[PDB]
RNA sequence: CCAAGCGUUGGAUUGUUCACCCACUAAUAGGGAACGUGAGCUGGGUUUAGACCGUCGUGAGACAGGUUAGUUUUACCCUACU
RNA sequence: ACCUACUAUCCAGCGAAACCACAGCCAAGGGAACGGGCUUGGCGGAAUCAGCGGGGAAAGAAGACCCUGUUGAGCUUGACU
RNA sequence: GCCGCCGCAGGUGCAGAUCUUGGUGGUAGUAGCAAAUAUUCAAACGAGAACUUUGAAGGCCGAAGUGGAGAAGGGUUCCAU
RNA sequence: CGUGCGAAUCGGUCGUCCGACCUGGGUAUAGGGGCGAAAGACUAAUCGAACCAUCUAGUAGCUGGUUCCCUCCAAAGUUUCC
RNA sequence: AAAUACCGGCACGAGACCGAUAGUCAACAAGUACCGUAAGGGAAAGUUGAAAAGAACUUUGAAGAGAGAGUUCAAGAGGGCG
């Protein structure tokens, strides 16, 4: 299918895509904007050290009441967190992207993640019980993802 | 409609921005006013809160019922290693205030003082004042320098000095020595600056700033206490036991209309660690440190004239949560701000002091050393052995 | 690897509480294909699955 | 007269607003703030449904005539203040 | 005053509601006579974590009190049939 | 699959009705997963062990039982792959 | 607790406890009707007249709403009788 | 006996009608899913393409999810798909 952008030139550049992923849309969108301006082997590294709490993700848009921490000044900010399932997901996705560079015949060490986007997806309903005999909803907020990498020394 | 019976109110409405102080060392907000009549001296100094104990004295004040009788008054112990100047600093008089004019430093600045310029001494090449000193022994840095000492000699009117403490000599964990401006009050700025230079790199002891039975003022930071409630912070009435959502409160915030809520009214929030300036604390004795001579070491600080035993102010088991006190000290009547181990800026008074409770000369008859860590009964270790006999260890 | 079952048929031959049964750890492979009462009546004879002795309440 | 800088309290009977008495005191001046103030409290009074009298009506019923018992909901949004 | 238990607080995983013209710093003035928006003055410096319960004539229910309606029902007798 | 001109015909034009039906926001990654004491160390199955399985420790129910079996009612939820 | 665990619970303290005691099954009483040691109580979360369908789109001097443009003229709250 | 009546039944033929929130409650396993002890109450829900030609082989992954091959005029028609 198509991606929110092309690749600038198709010969030097690889894709990967994620349909209906059971993660939080927002936590994902926030971790997918730190990752953005980094090399692959800075990225892989930065997403083990989120998982192991030595480097936080900045909560910039979606910061309703979100805490404050010591590893966020690093991002000149004050709010931030350590979303672990969001990482363990888009640390799968890489493996696929990485795994399409050699099946063209390209340099896996020069692949600069250009494109990476995060979209809302169809909600999954389940239900939950509140006083005076009533029933609210209790719904799921999944997502799709995409990304596009490109070779540069 | 009105308040049925009256009261007074809850707390002081000058002191009210009850925030955690911007600085950890007490700032001197205001030194005295000089008169060119009297000779040069420093004003301020630096100690550390190390303790508290009794005294006993025989009092003279004719009139009262404690005349020639023997009270006990309480005291604090402030430990004062003699301070080390490293520079001077000039200020000029203006119509927007008091602009700081020119600054200079000594050739040799210690490493507890090269520790005061860094956030991290572990990784840093210790390169502060490396290119600077250089000037002090080349023939093109004796002239530029004394161009400028001859510029303060004209333009500047206020003159100050700068002194680093000595944390090689205290029993604390830390090693970062405090730099602190101090005003030099005295003769015309010519003299004021003949004296300063001459003292770069020297030591200045507490014998020289302060004297016995003086009235000093005591500046520092409070013992801190946490985000605390309205009942602890402001000292209101509790509420009565029937109340649906709590009784350590104010029950009426404000009226209906001037429909805001006013900075006058009492609220939750941070309790303590403010800055603060108490006054008129007396000086009952200036101590002497542990000087060695002729083999033996001499350690009679606490030796009053009325019991001459061998003891120093140090108590059995040491002072608690602090250390042992070797370095020369001052003995303040009354209590002072801050925890133990916390740094206590001194000062003369602004206010020229004549009453009777000022001019009261003091000599003592007892100084306490019975261990404070427990509930003590013994004044000195040897005296114990003599009371108790030999134990199952001997 | 999984013996809610072999612990059941045990406690129905030893005529006791499942509490009292003892299923030798080491030989968890020899006891987790048994799976039918005869093949447990063996392993009781053999000394893998054993009864524990009754907890003392001293009347002393 | 200038002066509202600083205060103007503890108890008995009463649901009190009001009243009156004891005692201490420099003095126990008066008022506003939606008759300041219930998502601050208390519900003791009035002002639902049960019950009893004391006047009125043949009666269902009625009382500024008195009585007993009667469930006080929400804050996570903006501001304000800390 | 101080202590203990559980929350509150901070982190991973899961994750609902009521409510919402547009919104949200004050004086006084007029005005359907008690303005967040108008007029005259004072002023206005990203984004936010914990609390509080002054203000939104806060939310919650087409006032249960009173009056009207040529709208009713439960009770009672000398109202009429 | 559709439109202009002359004439006919009507279930013919929305901002609103605490209007009908369907879909989506701000609030918000916030309120919150707090009643009846309590767990920890080793192994073995596995792509994944704070929670499942075995073995060892420390605990609770304490025969008016968190034990053993029935009647109404449920209707296969029983048992192994 | 009061957007609860509960459309009436839970906790400590409480009333009775060999007698007009306290409970299971089978049975009789049906809506101006039943049953009531009598509060207008109870009659399947409903009671000073239960629930389901129809007559029915019941009637309203009273609330709320009432869909395209330009052009021209533009009022009334006063008089008798209800 | 006839000339009259016929929103139930068995077959038929038309329409200046409505076109999937319309038109019957019902274009489809509807008087069906489900609710009420029972009388009774009662929905939502049409569309790949001309043809299944419904994507062999390779490759990352434990798996869903992917990268390239390929059918079609098109997957910018990929099994709830104009």
UniProtKB/Swiss-Prot annotation, chain A:
Component of the large ribosomal subunit. The keyword Ribonucleoprotein applies. GO terms for biological process: cytoplasmic translation. This is Large ribosomal subunit protein uL22. It is found in: Cytoplasm. Keywords: Cytoplasm, Ribonucleoprotein, Ribosomal protein. Component of the large ribosomal subunit. The ribosome is a large ribonucleoprotein complex responsible for the synthesis of proteins in the cell. GO terms for molecular function: structural constituent of ribosome. Belongs to the universal ribosomal protein uL22 family. It comes from Oryctolagus cuniculus. The gene is RPL17.
Swiss-Prot record, chain B:
Belongs to the universal ribosomal protein uL3 family. Constitutively monomethylated at His-244 by METTL18. Methylation at His-244 regulates translation elongation by slowing ribosome traversal on tyrosine codons: slower elongation provides enough time for proper folding of synthesized proteins and prevents cellular aggregation of tyrosine-rich proteins. It is not required for incorporation of RPL3 into ribosomes. One of its GO terms (cellular component) is cytosolic large ribosomal subunit. Disulfide bonds: none annotated. Residues 1-36 are annotated as: Disordered. There is a cross-link at residues 38, 223, 225, 285, 365, 385, 392 (Glycyl lysine isopeptide (Lys-Gly) (interchain with G-Cter in SUMO2)). Coiled coil: none annotated. One of its GO terms (molecular function) is structural constituent of ribosome. PROSITE patterns: RIBOSOMAL_L3. It holds the Pfam family Ribosomal_L3. Residues 17-30 have a biased composition (Basic residues). It comes from Oryctolagus cuniculus. Keywords: Acetylation, Cytoplasm, Isopeptide bond, Methylation, Nucleus, Phosphoprotein, Ribonucleoprotein, Ribosomal protein, Ubl conjugation. The modification Phosphoserine is found at residues 12, 303. The gene is RPL3. The modification N6-acetyllysine is found at residues 135, 285, 293, 365, 372. This is Large ribosomal subunit protein uL3. It is found in: Nucleus, Nucleolus; Cytoplasm. Component of the large ribosomal subunit. Interacts with DHX33. The lineage of its organism: Eukaryota, Metazoa, Chordata, Craniata, Vertebrata. The modification Tele-methylhistidine is found at residue 244. It comes from the Eukaryota. SUPFAM superfamilies: Translation proteins. GO terms for biological process: translation. Component of the large ribosomal subunit. The ribosome is a large ribonucleoprotein complex responsible for the synthesis of proteins in the cell. There is a cross-link at residue 293 (Glycyl lysine isopeptide (Lys-Gly) (interchain with G-Cter in SUMO1)).
